[PDB]
Ligand binder design. Structure first.
Ligand SMILES: Nc1ncnc2c1ncn2[C@@H]1O[C@H](COP(=O)(O)OP(=O)(O)O)[C@@H](O)[C@H]1O
Ligand SMILES: [Cl-]
Ligand SMILES: [Cl-]
Ligand SMILES: [Cl-]
Ligand SMILES: [Cl-]
Ligand SMILES: [Mg+2]
Ligand SMILES: [Mg+2]
Length: 265
């Protein structure tokens, strides 16, 4: 259907391991959107054609205000182009760089939006498994949107693909290649809540090995400024045993969440 010729490409929005994302406008409609560009030889080499397929299938069919829309795709013998909803306010990653730490209202609002999106995903047994600030985008009203569903699967699942980057957002079962399910995204929510309030993730370390050790032993401590309500939610989410992690409904109705969030469940 679409081809490269139908679009005027604009400024670079960002770069991932595989994605090179650009602002773009469709010529006929003048519709502004984001083009995620992937190099076929890079996908083949790393063997992640299944991730690309997964991303297209899942994001084209999911419909939720806190999940980024994928509209379609096309290709040209060197690259694949995913046609995405454009997120004008950038990433939570950037915003964290800007502000260093988030206040409790901003944190609880993001956690609420995340939890609403994940609740919708999990109802279909879709687990994301790659929740981290670079994959959380902001819409025109500043609302969080989950993107980058390439690592997503239907639960329960094993891990077949190599872990390339940081382990910071991943639970013990996921790193160790054990079977896992929905509860992986709950652990990640805990990591995010801590990072939002503190400015860095709780198991952060100087090496991959040190990071892995901290995660498998669940070794984290709180700075003095983290309030008791936050400590409670975060402690509940960051449990080694997945079955002990709370339900998303329990996150949404947590007293620290309901007192600080500007958005409802
Ligand atoms: N729809 C979008 N709107 C605005 N920026 C985006 C969009 N998609 C991606 N980006 C930016 O590009 C980066 C990489 O995109 P992503 O889809 O995560 O690629 P990868 O799959 O390689 O990680 C994101 O971290 C973000 O900075
Ligand atoms: Cl249209
Ligand atoms: Cl599997
Ligand atoms: Cl996998
Ligand atoms: Cl729930
Ligand atoms: Mg990404
Ligand atoms: Mg990806």
């Amino acid at each position: 259907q679409w081809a490269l010729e139908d679009f005027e490409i604009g400024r670079p929005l960002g770069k991932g391991k595989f994605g090179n994302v650009y602002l773009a406008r469709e010529k006929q409609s003048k519709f502004i959107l984001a083009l995620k560009v992937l190099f076929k030889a890079q996908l083949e080499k790393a063997g992640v054609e299944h991730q690309l397929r997964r991303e297209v299938e899942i994001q084209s069919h999911l419909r939720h205000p806190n999940i980024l829309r994928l509209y379609g795709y096309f290709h040209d013998a060197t690259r694949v182009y995913l046609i995405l909803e454009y997120a004008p306010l950038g990433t939570v990653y950037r915003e964290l760089q800007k502000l260093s730490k988030f206040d409790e209202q901003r944190t609880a609002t993001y956690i609420t939006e995340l939890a609403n999106a994940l609740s919708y995903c999990h109802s279909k047994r879709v687990i994301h498994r790659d929740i981290k600030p670079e994959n959380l985008l902001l819409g025109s009203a500043g609302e969080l949107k989950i993107a980058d569903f390439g690592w997503s699967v239907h639960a329960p699942s094993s891990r077949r693909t190599t872990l390339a980057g940081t382990l910071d957002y991943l639970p013990p079962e996921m790193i160790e290649g054990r079977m896992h399910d929905e509860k992986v995204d709950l652990w990640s929510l805990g990591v995010l809540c801590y990072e939002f309030l503190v400015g860095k993730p709780p198991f952060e370390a100087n090496t991959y090995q040190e990071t892995y050790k901290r995660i498998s032993r669940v070794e984290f401590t709180f700075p003095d400024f983290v309030t008791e309500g936050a400590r409670d939610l975060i402690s509940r989410l960051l449990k080694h045993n997945p079955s002990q992690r709370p339900m998303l409904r329990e996150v949404l109705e947590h007293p620290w969440i309901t007192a600080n969030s500007s958005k409802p469940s």
